[PDB]
Structure formats: structure tokens, C-alpha cells
Design a protein around this ligand. Structure first.
Ligand SMILES: *C(=O)[C@H](CCCC)NC(=O)[C@H](CC(C)C)NC(=O)OCc1ccc(Br)cc1
Length: 214
């Protein structure tokens, strides 16, 4: 497909805010799951980022983590709670079990061929929102406000932030990836940022992408 924007089909929930917690990966993971859930059931709702922060032991909660492990967890645990049944508190707590909390399930996940933007594009068009990792350490990124973001000093080999690709397209001749962050709706462009697509895998956008099976 030439251009995709899952927000137009109602596959994306509102922009969240990590608070005082480095739980970007939990947010990235739920966003993908929320997508497969909308596609599968027709229901659009917030999943529990906290459920993952607290239970994905392979990870390190507020200290950071990886999306794959989160997907592996939801599959092994036979489910993930919703935001309502397992609200976000912004810090790591003991893993809670909500008898009525299950709101989605995961039967695995797939990875995108490392550094392949073309494969990332095909995956977004056919699957839905995809979880991707990038280098967000540049002041240029942290202070992004508008336009298609590109900074040559971005480090493809310095993955330190997890986000969500809800689509892709082109703006003013510049191809981009539609990216949902989790620093609240006041960061970037209403919690969003258009990142350079096909610019030598800028910021390593396609170096660690994955989506959940549902
Ligand atoms: C995003 O908010 C966080 C910021 C963590 C620094 C405060 N970044 C991550 O969680 C990254 C996710 C991308 C690299 C995909 N993961 C990460 O930092 O891994 C660190 C880590 C430490 C210990 C364990 Br156990 C697992 C992972």
C-alpha cells in the first residue's frame, strides 16, 4: 500500500504519558496489542502498560525493557489486563492478578528483518501498528515540534527508545513513518512525530521492529 495511517481507521488509542518511569517499551507493546485487538474484535481500548512493567520479569520495569519479551509474556501468561483493570501508576510494583482483568491475548510475535525499511513498510500495511525501536537521545529529537524529523548524527546502533509506527506516507516530498510516542500529548505534535523513511534507516527505525500475533 502506498500510504497508511491507522489513526484513520480507529486502530490507535490516545497518547499516554510515561510519567517518571522509563516504561516506553511497555507503552510501545500495548499500542501494538491494542491494534491487533481492534482489527480482531472491533473494540478499541487501552491495555495495561503497568501489567507489563510489573510482570515482564525478563525486563527491568522503569529501568527499561524490550517489546518481544512483553509479547512473550502476554502469550505465556495467557493474557494481558486492560488499563482500567490494572491502572498505570508510573513505578514498578508487585505483579498483581486480576481474575476479571483479562482484555486481550497474544499467540506470539514476529520480528522485521533487521534494518529493512521496505519490510517494515509491508508489515505496517498488512498487520497494523508496529512497535519499533529508535535512538531518541538527540536534543533534536527530544525537542521535535513539526516536519519530518531527520538528523544525520542519529545513531542507528544506539537503540534506547521504544515507540509505535501507526503508519507512513510522505509530506512535502519527504517520506516518513507515523510515530506515536508516550510522553503525553504535549510532546512533539500532539504526542506524535513523523520520522524520515528511506533515509538510510534513520535512527535505526527498522533495527528492532516487531508486532504481536493475535
Ligand atoms: C524508554 O523509555 C526506555 C528508557 C530507559 C532509560 C531510562 N528505553 C527502553 O526501555 C529500551 C527499549 C528500546 C531499546 C527497545 N530498553 C532498554 O533500555 O533496555 C535496558 C534494559 C535493562 C535491563 C534489562 Br533486564 C532489560 C533492558
Amino acid at each position: 500500500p502506498d500510504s497508511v495511517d491507522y489513526r484513520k481507521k480507529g486502530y490507535v488509542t490516545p497518547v499516554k504519558n510515561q510519567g517518571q518511569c522509563g516504561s516506553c517499551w511497555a507503552f510501545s507493546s500495548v499500542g501494538a496489542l491494542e491494534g491487533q485487538l481492534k482489527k480482531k474484535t472491533g473494540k478499541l481500548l487501552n491495555l495495561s502498560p503497568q501489567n507489563l512493567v510489573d510482570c515482564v520479569s525478563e525486563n527491568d520495569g522503569c529501568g527499561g525493557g524490550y517489546m518481544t519479551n512483553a509479547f512473550q509474556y502476554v502469550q505465556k501468561n495467557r493474557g494481558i489486563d486492560s488499563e482500567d483493570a490494572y491502572p498505570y501508576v508510573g513505578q514498578e510494583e508487585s505483579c498483581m492478578y486480576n481474575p476479571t482483568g483479562k482484555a486481550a491475548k497474544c499467540r506470539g510475535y514476529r520480528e522485521i528483518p533487521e534494518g529493512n525499511e521496505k519490510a517494515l513498510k509491508r508489515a505496517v500495511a498488512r498487520v497494523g501498528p508496529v512497535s519499533v525501536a529508535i535512538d531518541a537521545s538527540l536534543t533534536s529529537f527530544q525537542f521535535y515540534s513539526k516536519g519530518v524529523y531527520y538528523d544525520e548524527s542519529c545513531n542507528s546502533d544506539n537503540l534506547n527508545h521504544a515507540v509505535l509506527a501507526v503508519g507512513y506516507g510522505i509530506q512535502k516530498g519527504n517520506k516518513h513513518w507515523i510515530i506515536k510516542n508516550s510522553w503525553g500529548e504535549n510532546w512533539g505534535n500532539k504526542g506524535y512525530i513523523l520520522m524520515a523513511r528511506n533515509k538510510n534507516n534513520a535512527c535505526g527505525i527498522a533495527n528492532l521492529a516487531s508486532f504481536p500475533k493475535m
